[PDB]
Homo-oligomer: A and B are copies of this chain.
Amino acid sequence: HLLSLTRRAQKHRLRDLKNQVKTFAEKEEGGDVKSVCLTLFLLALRAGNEHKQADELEAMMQGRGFGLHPAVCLAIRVNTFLSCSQYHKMYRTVKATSGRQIFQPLHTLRNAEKELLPGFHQFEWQPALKNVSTSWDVGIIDGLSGWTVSVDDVP
């Protein structure tokens, strides 16, 4: 059978249909046989109802790519209530699993996220604010607002 042979034998056996597809592409698709056999394999997998492998192939051929955007991963983390530790756990898992750094690790996710929190964008107010510190880049404050902690007064 064809799939058990080397390149030499399969060329020797398919030469006829190779010339057939070459001349059909030259007559209709400009002689670019690679895109023609790509589309034909895609359609033959579409008919075989194995959409999954054909879609993975189109992800290989001019596909969106392996990398996941760090922001989207931060999302899928928060939207799912997962940990910090557990995130890193499954991260190292998939990392050593299939050859790629599919998720970003923690610290880069943290860095990428720190802009999405409050206190990152610079701005102004016209006129300036009423009795408000013009400091902007600040993040999370403690709510007591400098409540003098001395026991003598109200706790």
Residues of A near any B CB (own CB < 8 A): 1-3, 7, 10-11, 13-14, 16-18, 20-21, 24-25, 28-30, 32-41, 43-46, 48, 52-53, 55-57, 59-61, 63-69, 72, 75-76, 79-83, 86, 89-90, 93-94, 97-102
Contact of A43 among B11, B55, B64 (CB under 8 A): B11
- A sample of 16 inter-chain contacts (CB < 8 A) reads A14-B40, A14-B43, A17-B24, A37-B37, A37-B40, A37-B41, A52-B101, A53-B60, A53-B61, A55-B100, A67-B98, A76-B90, A76-B94, A79-B89, A80-B82, A80-B83
Q: Which of A17, A24, A30, A43 has the most C-beta atoms of chain B within 10 angstroms of its own C-beta?
A: A17
Chain B residues near A41 (CB-CB < 8 A): 34, 37-38, 40-41
Whether B65 and A98, one on each chain, are in contact in the complex, defined by CB atoms closer than 8 angstroms, is yes
Kindly report how many copies of this chain are found in the complex they form together. 2
> With A66-B53, A86-B81 as given contacts, are A2 and B98 in contact (CB-CB < 8 Å)?
no
Bound state CA distance, A99 and B63, in angstroms? 9
